[PDB]
Amino acid sequence: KVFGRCELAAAMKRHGLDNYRGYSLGNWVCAAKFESNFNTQATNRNTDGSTDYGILQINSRWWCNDGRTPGSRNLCNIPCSALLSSDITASVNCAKKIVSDGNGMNAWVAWRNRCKGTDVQAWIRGCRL
Ligand code: NA
């Protein structure tokens, strides 16, 4: 599924991401835009052989099991393919654990490089939330 901007914002808000660990909703929408272009089926391979999955590009090195990242961890206790679903519940619940791990949203390289320090509230402008 490719989400619309306000559709994703509303779904992220319903799942409790708005101001989760102090990150306003526009941060999460900005992160999803530049990580996946709002596409739940997005995948990208990393240099170490791990793969990033889903709308927030969650990495198989630490967070999910894709059966092809030997020696890795599965801290969200899910198969990576669950992160590709049109239902974003698993992505959001895993994202909550990542953002809680000490580094905040700096865990997402696209957020640090393209969202941090900008007017992230602009990403939810016009939405009925
Ligand atoms: Na893994």
Curated annotation (Swiss-Prot):
Keywords: Allergen, Antimicrobial, Bacteriolytic enzyme, Disulfide bond, Glycosidase, Hydrolase, Secreted, Signal. Residues 1-129 form the C-type lysozyme domain. In the egg white and polymorphonuclear leukocytes. GO terms for molecular function: beta-N-acetylglucosaminidase activity; identical protein binding; lysozyme activity. Disulfide bonds join 6-127, 30-115, 64-80, 76-94. GO terms for cellular component: cytoplasm; endoplasmic reticulum; extracellular space. Pfam families: Lys. One of its GO terms (biological process) is cell wall macromolecule catabolic process. The active site is at 35, 52. Its main location: secreted. It catalyses: Hydrolysis of (1->4)-beta-linkages between N-acetylmuramic acid and N-acetyl-D-glucosamine residues in a peptidoglycan and between N-acetyl-D-glucosamine residues in chitodextrins. Monomer. Belongs to the glycosyl hydrolase 22 family. This is Lysozyme C. It comes from Gallus gallus.
